[model samples]
Target chain A: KNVVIYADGVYDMLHLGHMKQLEQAKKLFENTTLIVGVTSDNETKLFKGQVVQTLEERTETLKHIRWVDEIISPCPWVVTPEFLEKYKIDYVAHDDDIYAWLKRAGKFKATQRTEGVSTTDLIVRILKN
Target chain B: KNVVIYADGVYDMLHLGHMKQLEQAKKLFENTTLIVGVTSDNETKLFKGQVVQTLEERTETLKHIRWVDEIISPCPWVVTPEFLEKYKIDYVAHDDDIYAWLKRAGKFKATQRTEGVSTTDLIVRILKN
Candidate 1:
């Protein structure tokens, strides 16, 4: 089976933890195509209330990842029904419940993949005094 | 003229800085349309390096805003030429150079409605102690 293990994200400031996740995904499928999706510049400011890095900076960092096969910029917050339908993706993965909901919604064709101790923990820890 | 101003991001733990930006944007256009785009649960971890709020919490918070005419969940970062081309946007607002470049490129008419201090600045001040 051409298991297209899918993962989407911004990867603004690449860290050791991200490497682990990417490595794990790469190991699962030989023809694995990684889609790194980036949120738009406007979305970052309105949503995050803070724009840490420019789009170029974010994209540059993600492009350097040896494991990433393809990068999808302007990635939406959740996998749109259209994307799932178009890719006919085998499996989807992320660290949140959106994908699980997609599973329940029956929009997603593949099984879901999730991980632990995400970048959120890293940011909170860095901010924590 | 009726303007649909689209902005997207996480807005994790809404702060005073965000309130100020919204208020600023509201005063300009009477029938303003505010599209608050949040990062997808996946993109946030991969790109932003963290996740602050769940999709439900984020959407709930946005719906409460009086100025926001509409809320678009999970928006992209940079203003896509296609989006501008599609919306026939009169002006785009953002503080980043990307917007300025867009204006120069003549892709979309836009300006900067930047607030005095950003949430990141606030975070730094709190953490400096």
Candidate 2:
């Protein structure tokens, strides 16, 4: 693999912001394999305090993305170096804590923190919170 | 078996309208199984002229609902008696054309035509146009 850029997210709401991030990330890297992960509803509820969509729904959404090379639905607890290396994931793509976690664990060979606001924040703001 | 309620929709932007329909449909009968179907991005583009949320994002929102029992992704063209019978659906829930189609097809023993304003209309209204 030239440069495997691993990325996973609930991506529950496929917004324009997400599309921009994917496009920008792919452009930033030369040889990139974007491994997009759709988190299970249970996990979303656990972390985000609410679940957005179902597994099947998420899978259907990912199919529309041309930039996304491949997709996976990782179990909620499967966030570790062992898991990443097992999948040969070169980098971890997410927000602050997730990026820091991978960096501290030495799992990410190269880290690219995509610039943008969080989806949860966007929802709250859009809903007038 | 029990009364199975089969339904499908993009449900792209979760709003009170969608919830009202879901709640009303669930309360219409006892011993009912609600299978909420979420349309894919491609399907949304094909029929609705644009995509709102990715498949996973729609699924995430679906997980939060207590009324929905199970979820499925129906292909864009899979609306027919065969699809209904294969899923063992008793009633198909939708508005306008879908309700008419299921009733005319004779696949649905009973149908819940939940009356309410649509999400798209609400959006347009909220945006003040």
Candidate 3:
């Protein structure tokens, strides 16, 4: 049986860091299906501030990644138990801090953030130049 | 037998435009194998100037894209007949203007540029802010 792993993010810049994390997530299980959830623009703006790419654009970008088996655009930022059950997601992988409640429930699996590369890093470099 | 199509670029930002072009290239033939050539940092610097991401990073980004079957990082910027022959690439696709030399040689297939969205556009926006 295939294990479906869920990874969620803004995926704003479509950089190497995002790719590497997804690669790691896919490697975690045999016959793994990596389903990426892209946050909605509205949700991103509320917590993450302005996003350079819209939700549709971000979804399209994520959809093309070779590691990604499926994509959920405008996905809920928070991964509730119902969300996992509805999607048949066996595990959640993300580098971001999780609420203690989710961690205790064992619904969350940690993923590493690629060091020295990130969307914010790219934007900062451009702005500096 | 797979019809291996070659698409060459710096692929620096890994944006929607790149994704769309690859998507189109894949649709061109059945059982398509899309091989992307990401130019080396040295070659890109000489022509395109200061890439935000390194060749390794760019390669990792392209490797994750679902449409891409393979990647040749530090690949030759110009796709020569020998290069095509070596990789068994059936065709080349790009939106950039082909030099008369390559055009006459039938070394390239034209692809439409996704207007109003690109790495340059992203950089410009970041700098303007």
Q: Give the Å shift of residue B96 in candidate 1.
A: 2.9
lDDT per residue, candidate 2, A23-91, as tens digits? 555554688887777787777778775544457655655555546777777544456767777778767
Top candidate (lDDT): 3
If both were scored by DockQ, which would come out higher, candidate 1 or candidate 2?
2
RMSD of each: 17.3, 12.4, 2.8
lDDT of 1 by residue, A2-91 (tens): 566567655544444565566566556666665657777787767665545567656655554556666677777667767866766656
Q: After the best TM-score superposition of candidate 1, give how far the Cα of residue A48 lies from its true spot, in angstroms.
A: 32
Candidate 2 lDDT by residue in tens digits, B1-129? 477887677876654456656766666677788888888787687878654456876776665554778888543434777777788877777655555676776544433443333444434443563
TM-score of chain A, every prediction, order shown: 0.69, 0.72, 0.86
The TM-score of candidate 3's chain A against the true chain A comes to: 0.86
- Candidate with maximal DockQ: 3
**Candidates 2 and 3 compared by lDDT, better number:** 3
Better of 2 and 3 by DockQ: 3
**Candidate 1 residue-wise lDDT at B106:** 49
Please tell me what DockQ candidate 3 reaches.
Answer: 0.65
